[model samples]
Target: PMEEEEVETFAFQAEIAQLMSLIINTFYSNKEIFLRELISNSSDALDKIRYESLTDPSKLDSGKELHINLIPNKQDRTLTIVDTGIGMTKADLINNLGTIAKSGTKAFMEALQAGADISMIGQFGVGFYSAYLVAEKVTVITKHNDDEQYAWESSAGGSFTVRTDTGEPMGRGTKVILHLKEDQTEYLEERRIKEIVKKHSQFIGYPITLFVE
Candidate 1:
């Protein structure tokens, strides 16, 4: 039998740490923007995976439905952004949330500099971090194209935890659960969330559904 190698871990680069701190503190001014941030990111990600599927048919086999669902749990005081798109891995969440050295925005800009013709890198992959603005705890359940399902938990600026999920996601995608603060109860109201979605994301190509009674 072959033995598995232990994974190596390293700290964030100095510049990345500084950038992350700055982004966390200054990027979000309006708490209401949490919806726009997440929906925009989800639309972009869905577009990416679908475009990739054009060349490789198997990439679409993950079973994502190419839509976004807004779910609110009044009893638990939680709001969730559910999407069928290219989900993130453990490494992606850590590298993206903990550091800002190798940013999607920087990568897209470099591609543009190299004449790659890709348009705006929307939200700079900073949308995930926006959950902190409204929620005390954030949980992300995702399944990537080449990986198993995972659940990532965090309490913003404190620490994040990750583990595998025994139950598969509703196909391969992401479900971001935001544990709303007591005063942020407005977010759980269906009309409020839907109004925000229409105001900010009406132009999105995918369907946006709200879970309601």
Candidate 2:
């Protein structure tokens, strides 16, 4: 269990870098949209495994339940969004989150530059970037049905690093840990999280349980 784990670093795609800069500095006028985007992203992840399990059936046993958990720590200033769904492998992390905005980048940036509404957040994969609005650091620990567990981390500074996750076994899913910025500590409130989900995450198809204590 003490074998060395490979850690690799990769640069964000040109367009992705631009989007991160935009998201970090002056992208969304309402930071609450970050929660909405995150829940929607988890819903989307859940959709993938649910749909895939219909044919394979074996994938459903990964976590035994298809749900989302919001574990926010007020003292530590961390917001954890864990989902039992289709998790990302190393390449999936690099390709999906790393080069996420390639196809829709030009059009996505064009709209954002023109002051697009927050309604466009989840579409085209920029939804994950919204985490930077509230978090100074983001860590994604995921386990895909086909690959070993791994963790991807970044501060939205143009490059991200990946390493084997030698921590707890998540079974099958992704856990997003957001180290909140001082001013964004309000996100650690359980009541505020529920409010955000009820308002913008109404369409999410999975059961969302927000933990406190």
Candidate 3:
């Protein structure tokens, strides 16, 4: 922690930039995949904070219920996926989205070049990037237990922008704003989102709620 007037900023390295592109274009090829992505992400967050909260009860100070909120704005053609769980920090965005490139195929190619064990190679979990399959733009608003609120925005390309959020989080967790594509209008339907959720996320550990008008 710095003293007072110091400002800190983080940027993605070259490797992370490449990985981000690979992630956006890989896996999750269909439009209904948004539900699976949001639900899977929410379940992971809940499991993580719940496991940690067993030792540190202070993580739940936000009072936001541990659940997933699927808010659909049919008029505006946008869908928001909100989760009350372990929110992200600046470092987390950089590390998770930027660096930490997991490419088993790349590794396999390298190993094959070196004549190593290709059978030992494995792929990585890049589920977060699948959101780009449906949305053209994304906004991530998160509040963490140890830091100020943050808003991370990206256009699903190779670049992203992050800055301190203007307002505080409603609680400790994340809200993912998906600006749906013109052809991806089905995501704004409550029934569709619910059906997708029940199909893929029925076994999720947390309760999921939807807000629709």
Candidate 4:
């Protein structure tokens, strides 16, 4: 083990910064869809892991159960989503969350200028930033089969930080904790979360469990 924990910080790509600002400003009215976007992302991760397992059975060594867990904490005013899926490595966190490296950012912007459909947000991978709709801060703890556990954190529209986690191992998969904004308290309610999930993510391939207090 290292003598001390290591942390790194990175800025969003110029394109990602612009895209996030647009999403936050334009999509605020339809903020509830953030849950749908997140659940969809989780499902995609699970799909990737499943596909990888086809070639290497050891990938399933963590656990065979593929599912998502929603936990709400009223006191903390936070909502957490955990998934047994393909968790990210440090490089993945920076590439996936801190930048629009693989996205068609130029086309995305042109579409925006042309009055494109907002429904296509997920296609460009900006769905992850939707968490900012309700969260003042978002923290992701993930453990990939090929790497050690790590944490990534950011407040909306800013740079993000990543660090090696010293906490108990997650074994495999990812956990996202959203610290709700003051005006977004409803997301911390189990009933409200479940309703949103039923409306948008009911058809997700993996089972989704909501923890009730």
lDDT of 3 at 121: 44
Query: Taking the tens digit of each residue's C-alpha lDDT, what string does model 2 give over 78-137?
Result: 999999989987788888888655666666556556767555633645667778878989
- In candidate 1, position 60 carries an lDDT of 79
Error of 2 at 14 (Å): 1.1
Instruction: Please report how far candidate 3 places residue 202 from its true position, in Å.
Output: 1.2
Query: How much is 194 displaced in model 3, in angstroms?
Result: 1.2
Flag clash pairs in model 4: none
Q: What does the lDDT read for residue 91 in candidate 1? A: 74
If ranked by TM-score, best first, what sequence of candidates would result? 2, 4, 3, 1
Model 3: how far residue 85 lies from native, Å: 0.7
Candidate 4 Cα errors over 4 Å, as ranges: 1-4, 25-27, 102-117, 120-124
Q: Please give the RMSD of candidate 1 to the true structure.
A: 7.3
Model 3 lDDT per residue over 118-150, tens place: 333432334455566677788888877788887
Which wins on lDDT, candidate 2 or candidate 3? 2
Off by over 4 Å in 2: 1-4, 106-115
Question: TM-score: which is higher, 2 or 4?
Answer: 2
Whichever of 1 and 3 has more TM-score, that candidate is 3
Model 3, 98: alpha-carbon shift in Å?
2.5
Q: Tell me the tens digit of each residue's lDDT in model 4 across 55-144.
A: 999999988888999999998888999998999987788888876555566665454556564446445455677787688789999999
**Model 1 agreement with the true structure over 1-213: per-residue lDDT tens digits:** 344333323354564434334434443445676688788878887988899888887887877378999999999999999888887776776666554465564543343345442223455665455566578788888877788787776655544566676555566778889998787899999889878887767889999999896
Candidate 1: residue 95 Cα off by (Å): 2.3
